[PDB]
């Protein structure tokens, strides 16, 4: 992209390298939400995604992660404070690879996010879409296979490294 930043996650399975997933962040249309994810991926504010876990993976739906404060699926925080408002609903959950914010209801974005592995249109207007997988969808499909119907993973899937490319 000439405009949108690219970030990467190096994914690990029980500490072993699985592969790299890169993401285009739609700063052109969702700038505040894209900037939060970018800065959490570089760690430039002193905290962020490196070391955190994809704690909820449900095959056919999504891979969810990003709780680096409580490490139990209830936490996370943004670069703007603990939570920030839903920026816009311009983009929709149109298929595999969509990157969108997890939340606990309206205006509760922090750091948790999910990567869709299917179209999840029922989430439109309730979760802010802000990016998409650029390279490494095969790695996301590999992560998806470690999930289960209740979201518990059979091995621990972590972000071993992350940062900004280009």
């Amino acid at each position: 992209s000439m405009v949108n930043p690219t970030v990467f996650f190096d994914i690990a399975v029980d500490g072993e390298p699985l592969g790299r997933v890169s993401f285009e962040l739609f700063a052109d249309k969702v700038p505040k939400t894209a900037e939060n994810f970018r800065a959490l991926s570089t760690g430039e504010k002193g905290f962020g995604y490196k070391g955190s876990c994809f704690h909820r993976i449900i095959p056919g739906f999504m891979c969810q992660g990003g709780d680096f404060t409580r490490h139990n699926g209830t936490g996370g925080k943004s670069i703007y404070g603990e939570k920030f408002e839903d920026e816009n609903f311009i983009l929709k959950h149109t298929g595999p690879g969509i990157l969108s914010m997890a939340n606990a209801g309206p205006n509760t974005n922090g750091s948790q996010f999910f990567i869709c592995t299917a179209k999840t249109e029922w989430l439109d207007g309730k979760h802010v879409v802000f990016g998409k997988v650029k390279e490494g969808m095969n790695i996301v499909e590999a992560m998806e296979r470690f999930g289960s119907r209740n979201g518990k993973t059979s091995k621990k899937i972590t972000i071993a490294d992350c940062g900004q490319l280009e």
């Binding site: 909820r56 449900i58 139990n72 699926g73 209830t74 029922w122 119907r149 209740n150 979201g151």
Partner: protein
């Protein structure tokens, strides 16, 4: 011989549905939050001299996915409707569960127990009388519980079985 009962635990986020179920099944409490998607458990017990196989469906507090929630209610024979005594909104949600259960099951008489959980906490916002009055208006039992101390846990589940048996006598 024995009988089997399909029990479904419902109620708002964080009220203690899973903590109550884990106390019943595993006899322990850990003060950690692990938000549920869906889990099922089985336990053989004797209630009023009659051996029972309990099937327990531990649901998530969320209220999207109405097709799945409808199916939970169709399959379930009795419902533990849980609120937390320190969460007034969770108590205000209770009537919605009773309305949905009655609609899905096409009945004004569905086995249910009202459970006020977290009674060990010093931060009460829902008075016991308020919950007793609501339960009386429904004609259903009300039991205060603590998954932390185990107070009332067995009683809540066993009372629900008793309510199912009473309904089946009709």
């Amino acid at each position: 011989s024995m009988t089997e009962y399909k029990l479904v635990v419902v109620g708002a986020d964080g009220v203690g549905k899973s903590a109550l179920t884990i106390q019943l099944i595993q006899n322990h409490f850990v003060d950690e939050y692990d938000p549920t998607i869906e889990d099922s458990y089985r336990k053989q017990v004797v209630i009023d001299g009659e051996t029972c196989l309990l099937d327990i469906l531990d649901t998530a507090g969320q209220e999207e996915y109405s097709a799945m929630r409808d199916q939970y209610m169709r399959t379930g024979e009795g419902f533990l409707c849980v609120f937390a005594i320190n969460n007034t909104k969770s108590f205000e949600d209770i009537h919605h569960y009773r309305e949905q259960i009655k609609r899905v099951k096409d009945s004004e008489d569905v086995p249910m127990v009202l459970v006020g959980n977290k009674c060990d906490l010093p931060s009460r916002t829902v008075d016991t009388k308020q919950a007793q009055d609501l339960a009386r208006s429904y004609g259903i039992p009300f039991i205060e519980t603590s998954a932390k101390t185990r107070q009332g846990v067995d009683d809540a589940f066993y009372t629900l079985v008793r309510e199912i048996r009473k309904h089946k006598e009709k």
